[model samples]
Target: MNIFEMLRIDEGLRLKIYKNTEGYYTIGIGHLLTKSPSLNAAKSELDKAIGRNTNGVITKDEAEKLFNQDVDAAVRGILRNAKLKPVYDSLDAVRRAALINMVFQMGETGVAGFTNSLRMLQQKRWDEAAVNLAKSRWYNQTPNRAKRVITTFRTGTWDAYGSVTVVYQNGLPVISVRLPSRRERCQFTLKPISDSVGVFLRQLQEEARGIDRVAIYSPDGVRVAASTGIDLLLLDDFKLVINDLTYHVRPPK
Candidate 1:
């Protein structure tokens, strides 16, 4: 099995509208119906993706469609985090799936705080990383699943789980900041302090439409709300959510 199949199996395939573990309405393999472009449009897309309007249930293919879409959301959600991407980039394909499993298990933010574990994983200190993973509360809650993922990270094989795709969430673009050293990449920079939220967004739209979310960060990875003037020289790795897509902001290299 590949990443998608692994997730479907671990997460369980649900073709009906049911309350997810947290009580959120879900349909088709753990899909939560909500987001940009309006909830109606979102549901409509899922309906079409599932076929037959998914009045109550979806077919296998329909569920597959929705499942794949959600996978990308989590995938990009993991990669878009500048804090996480470089680490993700350092893994082999098998270990990459393992990390994705961790994100699937805890969402990106939850996995984000695994500072030492992430660092060890980045360094491919498999035994150490697995131990760090086991030392967490997640181990207590879902030891079986956590162990499966940790073993995948430790052993670099699918013996633990299965297989996955990529797309910008909601049909948005994939924009990046620092140009790849390959000499082929780059993204927008920014400006202003307070009262310029709309102003900044508009200027971004001036560069490209559909950008609706914005966040600033310093080189050291601290959130830059820009309480004071944000020196262009000081801007290092800011980003935007273009209609739910991730865009990293940085000057040309």
Candidate 2:
């Protein structure tokens, strides 16, 4: 059987608003009762399922029939509420499927609550989104299921960490910092003391334990900003050349 068909088989189609193992009300192929955008969406849908129930059991054929309609609504909810329509539509089929499943697990309302993650997605910052998702309560709750989703976001594949990339989380940018002429790269996220370069520099001085040096420069070799135990506002957007590794700070194009 195809993946979706097999998924349906594994989930087991039901024709009643029955309680599942964890006690959440569910019906039709493991779909949980959750918030929906349309009027009376979840409750009314429950009516349909309940109406179709025969001795609280439904045949695979009958349940498969309901599955189609549910899947359509799930997809539409994701497209409508994600607010990053173009980016979501631009993803490949597998990536799109991962998003669809996420919408199913958490309704559009719940998914929209992931402001930072969605912002990263809107910016097409896949690596940031992946790492951001990995740090969520959802990941802590469901590691096994989250593993593949996180992998796809981080690497765009089922395996591997993929290429090195800059990812931002909280108020700090997480990136790989390397010292010049060194084969090893240090991965860390800088904590923002303020909007000031001095605050950030002091943080690096206190937190980043290594050869003490920091420089911010442009691609053209002009030093745009620097810190030597002094506080100053950070250049709005600039390249951060720490140690010997360089990182560009700019919005995605």
Candidate 3:
């Protein structure tokens, strides 16, 4: 099964996947570094990273290195796809790791598209971060995606920036952070039904009531809270939440 299938909503992680700079859709980390590289270049870089990490055993070591390098990228991607960057960032290490794993299943560029979430992170408001994450064209487009990730954030174990371990205690996985304060915690919601990609895109288009890429938020905010000129992909198939309980296995609660 693909990596996505292996990590589903409310599952477990083996502390295996780790890598940095590798493009999810492209190939490896260094491959993505080359500005606007072709598919072949991306693949070549990934192969090289794999060769270096595992001493030419298999791509496993290479993949692990690339993933571990920028666990933040993985987190960024998941929150971006869900259009909930602020919420994703606010979460602790365990919850954040869960989201990161989910985004890793998706593409990095996919996560880079979370303009709204990024803004919230810049501001640093916990509630706004959570709300903005759930409120987006992406969120409406794939409700299940948001729900599943949020579920993991609320009650899942996540590990970021290198290796992380978990120990289940009374069902909750205790997280273990390498540097204590380096990790964070977060919570979100999940809906049963989700909107189709086609319908969500159409809604997003229609919602653009005569404007460029600028949009407004409710509760009287003159400043624009959202963008109008975005080409977010309407993924038809929902992503598989990286199932794990690594957070519960850690300390510093």
Candidate 4:
């Protein structure tokens, strides 16, 4: 219900730049970057934003700043929704934050259409409100995310990574690894202090001394994201590439 917890539910923790559903370049807690921070200004902005070399990838601090600014705007948007003000203002901080999180995801206009859900929320009918939330197309699209938000509404607690359990100790990615021959299988959990992919790779190399090279590749074998002794950023998920070895990233059994 807190701002930080709400952000985790809404945006997760996207440290790297990626396109949203709209295909616009976005980074740092679902921040839609303007045209200003293009490749030309990548280095300058990275230096100014987080004071670290990311090879154009944003740092955690940079994303945090954007999230702060965006959350303020989200709050303003909710406040401006005059129809919901009376009901919204009556809720405690936790419930208010949940509504704000919903508004932030769907926008005020989108949320306004949820007349039944709105009424349920206004009446403080928690169970009915949660059910109404889950009966929408949005829930069908991304069940994991919707369930997390629904649970927050039902119980007023934040589950950080929605339904997934991230095992990385210190913000490093949890990578599953397998040898090419399938003779050896293991998991590499990097715990990095710096958000730089370069630093992260080096840290991984040290820990994974047995491995020759650690890389990441898309399902099509394109090297979208990797740790190559320099900071970098690439698109989202697929199997992890450690030289000739490969390991599929999956939920824990």
Candidate 5:
């Protein structure tokens, strides 16, 4: 069965995504769902295929074949394990969808080796599963998204209303939430732009316009520029860091 038939994605958005890309709608859907500019075009395309086509009845055999053909062996390897199948099979649609995404992105072996999360899910330990999930490498790599998805599974709530920042505290990296309100909005964490680290800001801008005034800076004694506050232009010298401006959508209501 196609994702639309399985997940009930809205018809309008599906068509909107599909008309943009043929046979490549998942990429656009991925971008829209993740809000990652890196995959916006791809997500939009996938969204069309998923939203518009429900019953793979139109191409059930071919669709199934295509899905299997494209799915990486790593994912197949995980699915092959009888021990893991029951936990995965019992998950809710949203959780299942997330698994599909994870499997696709990380491959089967990496995902299969997530024993902590798999165990948590198997024991009907939803909260622990969420915790275990956040402990995974994927979660550590994308703290912002992992936290939200974990929250969704644990609380049965999916409010994309918050902002997150990665910070360094006493030389250790951390993640924190931003409070709402005009007074609270001006405050943000300070992060150093290493030679290859500043690329996120530039790409962030290309994905969302009007983000240039945001802060990025060089370390003290590093000598690109000295500023007490967030220096928006200080990260440009690095080979990977590109200075660009863009905006993020206002927080959800």
Candidate 6:
């Protein structure tokens, strides 16, 4: 829902120490706890959460506390940076979350290297910002996270890791979402956010999250094409009656 929750999902929680994907001696919420700053406060948190005897392990509460500290520090770091401050304040909440998520993982100075994207973000140019980010080595290094972050930058929304279908080309995602269909009778005409049928269904499913089932019906009382997103992709020009609401899905002219 929010960035912290999203980070928890992305980075994961480890109560004990383990080698990170990059081989750092990491602990709870991806904190590198070696000679780094307060492997001690970490121990402090571990001790506070656990008790006397320890195996260099921490509790979830302590881990999340450390997480908040790291996130807060990242926020301060980005907000005070000689660069990010100029436009950081102007971004929408979701966009700021996207930036904070990056700075939290890579550090403000690390993210500052994305000069072109940062400037593009400042100019309110979402498309250029995303493409610029896609051009960096950071994309190859952390491909999945980078795509989600890039998508957030481009669309200003969090689709979470489990949602959407994005097709990437040489690191850049070619997403040509359609405008709303030109049908007036359809009360809830959902728009596509990516070229994928799944993403379009995601938009429809949203209108149906608190739903049971959606169906298609002809005005003549005959059951027409129906069911869900994947199936709807190949078929159109139908009435989607769902969650007590009606919508129209028309093929593009």
> In TM-score terms, which candidate is top?
6
* Candidate 4: C-alpha lDDT: 0.59
Q: How do the residues 1-253 of candidate 4 rate in per-residue lDDT, one tens digit apiece?
A: 1666446435644566665664555666666554453544534554455666666576555666778877888888888887667767877787777777777776788778888888888887889989989999878875766776677677665442222122444545565433322324355454433354555456557754577876554433456544432113322333444543343333332
Error of 3 at 4 (Å): 13
Against the hidden reference, what TM-scores do the models get?
0.54, 0.49, 0.32, 0.53, 0.36, 0.58
Question: What would the per-residue lDDT of candidate 3 be over residues 1-253, giving only the tens digit for each residue?
Answer: 1123223222222222223223322332222323333544444554564554432223433544554554556544455454556555565655555446545544556655766565654455534545666776546655655554544444343222222333445534332223111244322111113423233324434542432331222111122213322122111111111122111122223
| Model 3: how far residue 76 lies from native, Å | 12
Ranking of all candidate structures by their TM-score, best first? 6, 1, 4, 2, 5, 3
lDDT of 2 by residue, 169-253 (tens): 6755654544322335555555445344555555556655774566555433356544532112222334555543344443221
C-alpha-based local distance difference test score of model 2? 0.55
Q: How does each model score on lDDT?
A: 0.60, 0.55, 0.38, 0.59, 0.41, 0.62
Please provide, for model 6 over 144-229, each residue's C-alpha lDDT reduced to its tens digit, 9 standing for 90 to 100: 77887888788886653321122334533332222222112112233333234435444555653455655554322245533334
- TM-score winner between 3 and 5, please give it: 5
Q: Model 5 segments beyond 4 Å from truth?
A: 1-79, 156-253
How many clashing residue pairs appear in each of the predictions shown? 5, 0, 42, 0, 23, 0
Worst 10 residues of 2 by lDDT: 228-237
- Of the pair 5 and 6, which is ahead by lDDT? 6
TM-score computed on alpha carbons, candidate 1:
0.54
Residue 223 of candidate 4: its Cα lDDT? 61
Model 4 misplaced regions, further than 4 Å = 21-24, 33-56, 159-253
| Top of the candidates by lDDT | 6
Best of the two (1, 4) by TM-score: 1
Candidate 6, after superposition: displacement of residue 144 in Å? 0.5
